[PDB]
Every structure is written in C-alpha cells, then in structure tokens.
C-alpha cells in the first residue's frame, strides 16, 4: 500500500520546522559519523594540499520523524533532504569542495521507524596540509582532515566517531605514488573560539615518502660525479688533456644538475636538504678544478711542490667529503 | 517547548519587509565587523594577487527582530538568512570569491532578545595586490583588503571595527613559505564616488620576502661561474684554444642560467635586482674574454706587455668583483 506510505510521509513533514534542531532548547543532539575513503587523488608539495574523495555518512535521531505501522527502513529521494533539518558540518582545513551531482545529486536519506536519520554524501575535497620540507626527500608528513559544526556550539550538538576505530575504512587500499600511508588516527575533542565551544573530529594520516628511488635518482649521480672529479688527482701532468676534460665535464654536469634537477623538484621557494647536498658536491668539484689549475700553474717552476700538492689532495679531498657527508647525515637523519 | 519558539519566529517573520533596511528613512544602521583569518593560501606575482580565507562576521541591530519571553540567543539554521535583511558588504579589489558550501553553505545566523543580529560567513577571496618588483627578490610588499557598502551611503549605513584594533585575529596562522608577516593594520574612512559617500574599512598586511632560496639558487652559481672565468688568466697565453674554450663556456653557461631563470615573474619593463646581478656577472665574464682577446692580439710582438696584462688582470678582476658585490649588497640591503 503505497498510499499509506505517502500519507505517513506527508504527516511526518506536516508542520515540520527546518529552522529548529531536534530537541531544541533541551539536551544536545548526538551525531555519529563514518567516512569511507574512496581514493586520495594527489598530494601536492607546491600547493601544500591533498585531494581526497569519500563517502561521508552522518547518523542522528529526530523524534519528529518517528513513524509507526511501516516495518521497513524508508530510503527516500535525496530531494527530501531539502525539507529536513541536517547538521551544519564542515571541514576547517578545506580549500575547495563539492558534492557530486551526476546523474543526480550524490545524496542519500534513510529514515528508520524510531526516528533515526542516516544522511550520506559523496564529497571530493582538497584539504590544506602544511609540510615540513626541510628534510626533503627524507621527510615524513602528517595530513589531517578536520570536521566541525559551523553554527551550533557544544550546548546544541555533539560529534563522535560511529564505530570507534572502525569509523574510517578503506585506508589500506589507498595507493599513493610517492607516499605510503604508515598510520591513520581518529581524534575527538572540543575547540573554543570567541563565539563558544564546538565539537571537533579529526582524521589524520602519517605519510612516509618512498626513498627507494630518490637515493638512486638525485644523490647517486652527484656522488659519482664527485668521485670522478677526485679521479683527476691520480693523472700525471703529461696527460693534461684528460684532467681538463674531467674537470670541465664534472663542473658543467654539476651546474646542469643544480639548475635543472631542482626545477624538476617541487618549485616552492624552500631550502631543502637535497639542495644543500647538491651545492656541497658542486663546491667540492669546483675546488678540485681550482686545485688542478693551481698545480698546472706552479708545475713548470716548482714540479716538486705540484707533486706534493697532488699527493696531499688525494688524501684531503676524500676525507673532507666524508666529513661533509657525516655532518649532513647527522643533521638530517 | 518547540512550538512556542516556532510561533515566536513566525510572528517575528510575519510582516517583515526584507526590501527595507533597519531604521529605513531615519538614522543610519551601525554595522560592526570581525575577521578571523584562517590562512593565506598563495601570493602570486604573475597575476599580482593573493588568496585569503577568513571568517567574516557582521554585527548589527534590527528592532523588527526583537523578541520577548525567550531568555535565549536563538542560533537559527543558515537558510533563514535568506529571509532577513543583511548588509550589502562587498570587497572592492577581489577578483574571484565564494562562500564554502560543503556540506552546507558555511553561514551562521544568531538572534538576540534585544534584536541584535550576528551574521557569519566563511569566505575565500582572491584579492588583487599590485606589487613593486624593482627590488626582487629583496622586496617588501603591502597587500590590502577593502570592505565597502555598495548601495547604502553614509546616511544609510556605518562601518566600524568591533573591538577596536582587536577586531582581526588569526594573523599568527599565516604561514607563507616565501614571505613573512611583518605588520597588519586596520583603517576606517569614507570614499566619495559620483553616487555619494560610502564607508570603507581596510585590512592591510606587510610582507617580507625570504632570500635564502635565491641565494642558494641564483647568486651562488653566478658567483662560482664568475670565479671560474678567472682561471683563464692563470693559463699560459700560448694555449689559445684552451683559454678561448674556457671563456666561451663561461659566457654560454651564464647566458643559459639567465635564460633558464625566467621563473614565475611578470614581464615588467624595469630592471629587478636579480637582473642587475646577472647583468653584472655577464659583464665580468665578457670583459675577461675581451681581455684574453686583446692579450692574444698583442702578445706576438710584445710578450712582456701581455704577461704584465695577465698579471694585472689576476688582481684587478677579483678586486673589482668584490667592490661590485659590496656596492650591490649595501644598496639593496
């Protein structure tokens, strides 16, 4: 009997006031929340934000919507949500968000005989995540999603994670290109602004950057170039062309790396550790070339001094580079 | 009793004329404003603007909305804001603004027994900010947000900062990786257009650009290449091919750095500080190459003069470059 269902639904909305929360003027209304992470689209270090798509479900109880005689859970059309009171939940750290609307608006309203309302949305949100890039690419980030009621204080509404630690699902199936989600965490608290205290839910992810290929891509070529620059100290002065070739090649390669690879790296004007390491290697190869130039200059008049300088350089340069690497790793690992 | 509140709200909204401002035809309505800054997402010199996210709150009084018998401040659903008079506040220098609308429109309406209305929005605005890049990247910018009433003159509405200089908060939340907030200022005034006088509020920030990234990426490579160009003097002047190759390599590397350092900057006609430094380094390497060319031209008949010219260049060029750097860093700092 669909006529009886229509009559009951019309009676439920008869005299309903969307401007008044459930139990207005009384105890706070408790709202439980679930999030199903469909995907995490991209994580940006330039824009300091990440994009995340989710099924966001809210659960609450409204006694004005309690119905009897229908032994079913009424899944209604989404437009019915326009005639009902819904919580003013929003995300504090979002920069842009939308609810999908193809083919219809991605929204679900489900009523229960006792007056319980389940309200589901499908939301793609870009959320800001400030990142400490000082240790890039050896860094580890912590990106949060914040959930709060915009207008109602703790005297009116309350939030909690429905299901405890199982409120948020689908994290383990998320694959990120340059990050691996080590852990996720759920927090509930209260936040005080000048207008009062509001409930707050937090969903945080700890991201560890995949270092397997970063070492082999941006560090190994520089270290090999520095070693090749060292190699020039073991060549006799009669083979000056080889020394000139090695020195010029290493210096030009380091200039090209500094100018281009860092451009390929995120273009945010930040001082990372990789930049310091590349600059150190560049300075070392430049010093090696200058040492060769000095040896060549003083070669004719004082061959013995040139030989002594080369022999001492063979020891000094690797030792100084080892000390520089030790300090760099101590200060960044 | 929720029915009493519902009937009181209906009585308040019965006969309410949204087309007429409070005290229409009489004294002006005083509107106080508060801003709680969430973040400044980005500051762009190419587009000459900055993105700002804020909680914008307005406080005014409407005697038509005064209610009695309910000793509470009614926090109403934001949709009722569509049925009340609100000030026509706009931002003169904005280019693209919106009110966040997930899950609902981030809007707050609060009524008081005395008739006072508190109206809050969460707004992201891309406000224009013309910048002077003559000292880039050692510059200091000043970006403002202008708040005005469009249709109502000073005989109809008044603007003031509620709370004095404590009307804007969240300044410490601003974290720009390239800038640093130095000072923020609040101004109130009147602006006269052909249609009359209007109230005006102004929130201004002074930003100072960081220099470490530019030191590591632009100045140091140029200095190193300039120092490399001086090795040509210490080479014997008979090795014509080697010295020519070294000079040409330095010139080409300088030009490649200059062409690759276009960066995210507008095509301004004036000369920036970085442009001056790059031109100076190019002038130095060009002068070194020209000095070698003169030496090669003249040494075939007067070897003593050529040797003297090389010996004097070895001292003149570093000293002149040191003087140039001293002048540059004393003028621009």
């Amino acid at each position: 009997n669909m006529s009886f269902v229509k009559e009951t639904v019309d009676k439920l909305l008869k005299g309903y006031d969307i401007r008044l929360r459930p139990d207005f003027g009384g105890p706070p209304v408790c709202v439980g929340m679930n999030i199903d992470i469909a995907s995490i689209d991209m994580v940006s270090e330039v824009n300091m934000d990440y994009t995340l798509t989710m099924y966001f479900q809210q659960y609450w109880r409204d006694k004005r919507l309690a119905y009897s005689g229908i032994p079913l859970n009424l899944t209604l059309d989404n437009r019915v949500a326009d005639q009902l009171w819904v919580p003013d939940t929003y995300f504090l750290n979002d920069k842009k968000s939308f609810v999908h609307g193809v083919t219809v608006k991605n929204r679900m309203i489900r009523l229960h005989p006792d007056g319980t309302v389940l309200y589901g949305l499908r939301i793609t949100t870009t959320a800001a995540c400030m990142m400490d890039l000082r240790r890039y690419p050896l860094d580890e980030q912590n990106c949060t999603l914040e959930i709060e009621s915009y207008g109602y204080t703790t005297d009116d509404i309350e939030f909690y994670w429905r299901g405890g630690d199982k409120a948020v699902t689908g994290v383990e199936r998320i694959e990120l290109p340059q990050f691996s989600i080590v852990e996720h965490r759920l927090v509930s608290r209260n936040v005080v602004f000048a207008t009062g205290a509001y409930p707050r839910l937090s969903l945080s992810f700890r991201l560890k950057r995949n270092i397997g290929y970063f070492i082999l891509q941006t560090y190994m070529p520089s270290i090999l170039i520095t070693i090749l620059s060292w190699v020039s100290f073991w060549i006799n002065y009669d083979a000056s062309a080889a020394r000139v070739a090695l020195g010029i090649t290493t210096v030009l390669t380091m200039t090209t790396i500094n100018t281009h690879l860092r451009e390929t790296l995120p273009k945010i004007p930040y001082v990372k550790a990789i930049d310091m390491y590349l600059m150190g290697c560049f300075v070392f190869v430049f010093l090696a070339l200058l040492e060769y130039a000095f040896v060549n200059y003083i070669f004719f008049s004082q061959p013995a001094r040139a030989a002594a300088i080369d022999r001492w350089s063979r020891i000094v340069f690797p030792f100084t580079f080892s000390l520089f690497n030790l300090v760099y790793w101590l200060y960044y690992v | 009793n929720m029915s009493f509140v519902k009937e009181t709200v209906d009585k308040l909204l019965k006969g309410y004329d949204i087309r007429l401002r409070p005290d229409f035809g009489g004294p002006p309505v005083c509107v106080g404003m508060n801003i709680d800054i969430a973040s400044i997402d980005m500051v762009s010199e190419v587009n000459m603007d900055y993105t700002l996210t804020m909680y914008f709150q307005q406080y005014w009084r409407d005697k038509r909305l005064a209610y009695s018998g309910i000793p509470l401040n009614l926090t109403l659903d934001n949709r009722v804001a569509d049925q009340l008079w609100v000030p026509d506040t706009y931002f003169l220098n904005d280019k693209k603004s919106f009110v966040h609308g997930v899950t609902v429109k981030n809007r707050m309406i609060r009524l008081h027994p005395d008739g006072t209305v508190l109206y809050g929005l969460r707004i992201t605005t891309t406000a224009a900010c013309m910048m002077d890049l003559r000292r880039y990247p050692l510059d200091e910018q000043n970006c403002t947000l202008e708040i005005e009433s469009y249709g109502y003159t000073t005989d109809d509405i008044e603007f003031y900062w509620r709370g004095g200089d404590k009307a804007v908060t969240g300044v410490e939340r601003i974290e720009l990786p390239q800038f640093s907030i130095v000072e923020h200022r609040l101004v109130s005034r009147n602006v006269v257009f052909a249609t009359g006088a209007y109230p005006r509020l102004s929130l201004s920030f002074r930003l100072k650009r960081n220099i470490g990234y530019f030191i590591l990426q632009t100045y140091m490579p140029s200095i190193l290449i300039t120092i490399l160009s001086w090795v040509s003097f210490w080479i014997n002047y008979d090795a014509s091919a080697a010295r020519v190759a070294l000079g040409i390599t330095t010139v080409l590397t300088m030009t490649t750095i200059n062409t690759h350092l276009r960066e995210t900057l507008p095509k301004i006609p004036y000369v920036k500080a970085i442009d001056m430094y790059l031109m100076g380094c190019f002038v130095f390497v060009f002068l070194a190459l020209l000095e070698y060319a003169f030496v090669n031209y003249i040494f075939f008949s007067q070897p003593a003069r050529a040797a003297a010219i090389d010996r004097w260049s070895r001292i003149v060029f570093p000293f002149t470059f040191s003087l140039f750097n001293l002048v540059y860093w004393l003028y621009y700092v």
């Epitope: 912590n142 936040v191 005080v192 509001y198 707050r200 | 601003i174 974290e175």
Partner: nanobody, 105 residues
C-alpha cells in the same frame, strides 16, 4: 627576570607556543603567544608593554623577558603548545602540551 621554555619533539605539528599564569585564588590567564616560524607575537593588555616574547629555532626555545614587575604579576606560570587548527588563542583548553609550574612573586 627572564623565563625560557625549551621544546623538543614534533614541534612542527604545534607551531604556536603560548604563556599562561594562574593566580593563587583564580583560574589561568593568557599572557602571550609566539609563532615559531614567523616570530609574530601576541600579548594580553594586562601585561602588554612590559613583557617581550621571542623565539630561537637553533635550540627550539621561546623566551619571555619580564620587565617592570608589579605585585599584580604574582602567579604560577605555564608554557603550552597549540596545534595548527586548535582554534582560539586566548583559551587554555585549546593547548595540548603544557610545562611545569613556575613560582614568581
């Protein structure tokens, strides 16, 4: 008198450090707040123009320099850390990590 509060650990997740003082017969009261990165400072009117706040990232220490002490400035002090999205600045409930009580008379 000069108070120094040294912080160690995940200081990037808590970029704001604040100072509070508790009267012997009252509740805690805000004193000042310092941002770690920008060095921006915020002060309360009751102790303004008398106290200065700075920070140094070499050791991650925030310094509160106190000048022109008065008998009204007798309270037990606390140094606290605030999260990035923790909300208001003048309210002790929004601060997660605290320090140890310091007596000044």
């Amino acid at each position: 008198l000069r108070l120094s509060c040294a912080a160690s650990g995940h200081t990037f997740n808590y970029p704001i450090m604040g100072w509070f003082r508790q009267a012997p017969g009252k509740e805690r009261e805000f004193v000042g707040a310092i941002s770690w990165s920008g060095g921006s400072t915020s002060y309360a009117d009751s102790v303004k123009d008398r106290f200065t706040i700075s920070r140094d990232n070499a050791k991650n220490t925030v310094y509160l320099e106190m000048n022109n002490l008065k008998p009204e400035d007798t309270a037990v002090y606390y140094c606290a850390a605030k999260g990035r999205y923790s909300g208001g600045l003048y309210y002790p409930t929004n601060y997660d990590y605290w320090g140890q009580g310091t007596q000044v008379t």
